[PDB]
Structures are given as C-alpha cells and as structure tokens.
Design a protein around this nucleic acid. Structure first.
Ligand SMILES: [Zn+2]
Ligand SMILES: [Zn+2]
Ligand SMILES: [Zn+2]
Ligand SMILES: [Zn+2]
Lengths: 195, 195, 195, 195
DNA sequence: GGGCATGCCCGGGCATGCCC
DNA sequence: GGGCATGCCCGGGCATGCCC
C-alpha cells in the first residue's frame, strides 16, 4: 500500500471546495492567497484562515483533516516535519501544521506511513453564513534548514466521515516566508514573464 | 531453461503500458524521459516516477515487478548489481532498483537465475484518476565502477497475477548520470545527426 | 567571577602567536585567512589548519585550548553552541569546534560558565620545522538558525601549562560560510570603501 | 598525539634521498616521474620502481617504510585506503601500496592512527652499484570512487632503524591514472602557463 | 595516439531572512 | 518598503577512463 497520500482534487458528492480571504499586498502581509497559482503565502506561527465551502451538508461526525506533502517529485515520499530548531523552541513539536481556536483538535502520527495530520470536527456554517473557517498555523518557514529546507509543500484538506470514508479533498500550495507579499508578487511576475 | 528474462513488449489482454511525466530540460534535472529513445535519464538515489496505464483492470492480487538487465548482447547474461562502493555506504544493499513510498515492497534474489527484482502490489488508479505511479530509485550511476560500469541497462516492468502468470510487460532504457538534461540532449542530437 | 573569557592578545613570555597558510581566492575555497581583518573564512565541517608559533619552548604538559565567543557586545555573554539541526545529524554534538587528527583531544563543558572548549597537548615542532599545526573543524555555518544565527564569533586560542597557568592567548575572527573567497573579498572591499 | 604523519623532507645524517628512472613519455607509459613537480605518474597495479640513495650506510636492521597521505589540507587527516571495488577483486586488500619482489615485506595497520604502511628491510646496494630499488605498486587509480576519489596523495618513504628511530624521510606526489604521459605533460604545461 | 563521455569543479546569479 | 548577505541552483567547462 502506498504511503504517499493523494493530492488530486475530489469535490465529491457534497461539493467540497476551499475559500481564502483577500488580503491587500503589503510586502510583509501576514498571509495572502494567489488564485492564479492556487498558493498561500504566509508567515510562520501566524494565523492562516482557510474557508470550507460545501453544496450539501456533510453527515454528523464528519471530520476535517490537514496534511502537508512535498510538491516536487523527488521529495514526495518524504514526510513533512518541523525543523529541529523550531521543534526545540497539545500539538506535538514535530508537527508543522497546527489548528488554533478549536477545542476538539487531534494530532495524528500515522502508525504505518509516519505522516503527520491535524483533524478537527466539521461544523456547518452558523444559521446565517456561507462557509466555515479553520485557523491553521505553519510552524516553520519553507526555508527552514533541517525541515522543509526551501522545498515547496502542498496542504491537503480532506473531508472524511466518522467511518473514515473520503468525502472530499482539496489542496493548495504553501510558501511560508518572512515577506508573503513580496514573494507572491515575485512568483506571479515570473509566471507571466517566463511561465 | 534461460536465465535471461524477456524484454519484448507484451501489452497483453489488459492493455498494459507505461507513462512518464514531462520534465523541462535543465542540464541537471533530476529525471527526464526521451520518447524518441524510450529512455529515462535520471540521477542516482533520486525519485523516478513511472506511470502504470491499463485498458482493463487487473484481477486482485496482481503484482508489479521491476528488473534491470544489460542492453548490449555481450553483457545480457550478467546480473545487474549495485557497485561495491554504493553497496557499502528493507532494500538489500546489492539491489540496484528500489521502490520508495510503498509499505508492501518485496525484494527478490532469484534462487536459480540470481537476478534481482523489486515487487509491489498493483493498485488501480483512485476513483478520479487515469494511472498509477510507482516511485523507483536507481542506487548507482550508469558509470559506476564495479557495477554497471558505463553499460546501458533496460528496466523491465512486468504485470503479474498472484499465480505468477505474465499479464503484461514493458521496458525502457535507463541512463543514471549526474546531468540527465545534458546527456539526453547529447544522445538525441547524435541520433539525429548520425543515427 | 566573570563567565566571559578574555579575548585580549597575550603573547606572553614564550612569544606565542598564530599562523595561517595562504590559500588562493577561489570563490568557494575551503579556507582563507585575511590578515587585514584577522579573520578566517572557511566552510563547515572542513579542515581549518592553524599554526602555533613560539619563541621559547613551553614546559612539558602544556595544553592548547580553543574556544568560541560572540564578537559583538550584545551577544558576548551567550555561549556559542552548535545549532539543533547539525547537533542532531568523541566530540559532543553540542560543541561547535572540533579538532581533527589528534589522539589526545579533550572536550570540556565548563561546570560553572557552561562554555565549550576543545583541548589538545602542545607538541613542539619536529626537529626540522618552525611551527605546530592543529586541524580545527567548525561544525556550523555562521548563518545557522538556532546557533550562531549570522553572528560573528572569535576563536580564542590559549596556551596553558598543566597547572592551568595562562601562558599565552591569541584570537581570530571566524566566518563559516559556503563561499569563503567571495565573503572575504566582499568584506575587504567594504573595509576599503567604507571602513 | 597527532595521527597525521610528517611529510617534511629530512635527509638526516645518512644523506637519504630518492631516485627515479627516466621513462620516455608515451601517452600511456606505465610510470613517469616529473622532477619539476616531484611527482610520480603511474598506472594502477603496475611496477613503480623507486631508488634509495644514501651517503652513509645505515646500521643493520634498518627498515624502509612507505605510507600514503592526502596532499590537500582538507583531506590530510583521512586515512588513504583502497576503494571498495579494487578491495573486493600477503597484502591486505585494504592497502593501497604494495611492494613486489621482496620476501620480507610487512603490512602494518597502525593500532592507534589506523594508517596503512608497507615495510621492507633496507639492503645496501650490491658491491658494484649506487642505489637500492624497491618495486612499489599502487592498487587504485587516483580517481577511484570510494577511495582516493580524485584526491592527490603523497607517498612518504621513511628510513627507520630497528629501534624505531627516524633516520630519514622523503616524499613524492603520486597520480595513478590510465595515461601517465598525457597527465604529466598536461600538469607540467599548466604549471608553465598558469603556475 | 586521437578523441568522446561523464562526474564534478567553477563563477554567475537567484531567493529569502532580516537589517536599515 | 528598500536593500544586503548568504546558501545554493545553474550552465560552462576541465580531467580522466576508455573506445576507436
Ligand atoms: Zn523551522
Ligand atoms: Zn555505484
Ligand atoms: Zn548548524
Ligand atoms: Zn580502486
């Protein structure tokens, strides 16, 4: 059995999709999302709100899981972990991705694949709104030595029922950096000029 | 009975064929496939994704075997092994080909032919995709002294049922090297100018 | 009592001084010493030869101690350590400075000051030469996150008798980096243009 | 105590010096010596005759020892060994340097420094000649992967009495290669043009 | 002996954490 | 927000085992 989780978008029978909030591109804005690149640019240990959108309401007991994988083919089979520095200085210190502001968060270390994930219960949007927001946190920069070490990652968000069935899957690239607005504008300019 | 395994393409009743991802020809790209040559150019100990495509779904318990053989007639009967340097510094150290990212990988040392092979279970593409990707690893350069020693090899991929029936066979040439982009462009140029 | 060791040059009654071998300024030469800056530029985990010169021969049992301290006033009281990444992947893993090629090397963790040092016996130059060379090793880049973190250090070399009397002291600045030739030429140019 | 043996020439009270025979510079001559570079160019596993010259006859029981060390500073503390390939395919297989045609040859693995050496008894030149020749053999190319790996070496010849006293020391650089005449002419031309 | 292929050295230059 | 320093990617090119 493969230890590499799928990243292919699966909107599923519930119409599962992600949403992200517009940001305003200061050089060091705390987070900013590029629709053209399907890529979040954000700062380490700071809030990265992700919206959950569904056409049909999931069944009770549905869970929302987040997992990071390296985007490039030569690194895909390597588990994404926190670097030794940020690990040394609740959430186990080896986990890259945290969820803030949720009382039912669980951190999994898969017994077979060794991959990390963080799971919270799915809550339908309150009577009166269109989506559900999760406050994620990335605890390393993409550049961290001994961790992501300048390798781009994807975050895989899966909607799963209590029985474990995959109900939906979406993914976005993440670049954790000191200056999200600068790096977003640079990669988007490179895309237009040399893409 | 012959100890030289067949390399002849046998697409079989299941329409078995291999696929490879386009790469972009940097001089030292980690892997790049040449369709004109049916030849993978890749770097040692780095991921080499190979796609499995089928027209019909194989029965349960189907396995996928990979095995290296020397391409040239005068070397065909010699077992392809890891060189002593890379052998010394679950995969046995003598095996050239490894599979990354699979929990059910098996390494075989044939009791009679002494040939090495690595086997994983066949998994059908997930509901929502067209092929299955295996992450292969070549643990020597083609040039390694005491190993391949600058001799070209073929990788033979066989689809086999649990009973051992050959369901399909495909093969591609491999050149493991420091600069796959350079060597691919050089051989393709030699093919055009002097082939 | 102060836990900050002295860096002031004390050539002493034995005429103790340090020497360094000229290098040739390739961009990524493994080590190169700048006399104008009294500064070694070297690569991590690679040999950095340091010459011991004396006018008078030290008594038997003399020892040679090396110790790193931060050069800048605001960091001087912080112990120089290996960063967590290089620590994790006879020399204790927390020590920045190692000595290669000596059978009588000792690594000290000071019980009171917590500072690290590495000591070898002093050997007089062999009948027929002018100095004694010690092969030092710096196990982090100056830029290492969670370690030196881009802060310049000094290496303090003390000649001590077996009783612990300070016989001599010398020091040089160290910049461990990927391209010692580039960084040396850049700092020397900044010194000339704006020093 | 240092584990790096001295390479400094010590002609000593017996006037100890090496001699080498003129060769004639075919591209692949089996061995050829460059006086300008004090450097032997030779082929692997082939005879490399070295002459021993003395002004005064050594005492009975004098021994002749040969030992290889890396010439460059960043490799000097590493023991010079045979590569895994030539080790796998009398003299222990890990030893680079052998002596041919001598019935009293000894191979030492130093218990403390781990360095290899090969020793034969010193014989004075027969009544009627000026020097004594030893037939050395280098069992790897300088290029061998996992061995010298393209790093230049020195051979240190020491004349020692039976008690262990150093009587004399000389050294020459060695380049073991397929084409000694080509590589000698190339390095000598580079010396004139860019030295 | 002439010349090719290939592992790796080499300097130019990019990206990114952080000083200013 | 502008700009510097630095680890490392990148293509040019050298050296060397071996084919011819
Ligand atoms: Zn980190
Ligand atoms: Zn190998
Ligand atoms: Zn470090
Ligand atoms: Zn060898």
């Amino acid at each position: 059995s493969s230890s590499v989780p799928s990243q292919k978008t699966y909107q599923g029978s519930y119409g599962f999709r992600l949403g992200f909030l517009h940001s305003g591109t200061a050089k060091s804005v705390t987070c900013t999302y590029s629709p053209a690149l399907n890529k979040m640019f954000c700062q380490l240990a700071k809030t990265c709100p992700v919206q959950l959108w569904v056409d049909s309401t999931p069944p009770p007991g549905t869970r929302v899981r987040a997992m990071a994988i390296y985007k490039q083919s030569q690194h895909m089979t390597e588990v994404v972990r926190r670097c030794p520095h940020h690990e040394r200085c609740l959430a186990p210190p080896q986990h890259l991705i945290r969820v803030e502001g949720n009382l039912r968060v669980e951190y999994l270390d898969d017994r077979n694949t060794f991959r990390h994930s963080v799971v919270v219960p799915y809550e339908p949007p309150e009577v009166g709104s269109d989506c559900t927001t999760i406050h994620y946190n990335y605890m390393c920069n993409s550049s961290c030595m001994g961790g992501m070490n300048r390798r781009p990652i994807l975050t895989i968000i899966t909607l799963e029922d209590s029985s474990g069935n995959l109900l939906g899957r979406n993914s976005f690239e993440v670049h954790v950096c000191a200056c999200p607005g600068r790096d977003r504008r640079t990669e988007e300019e490179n895309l237009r000029k040399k893409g």
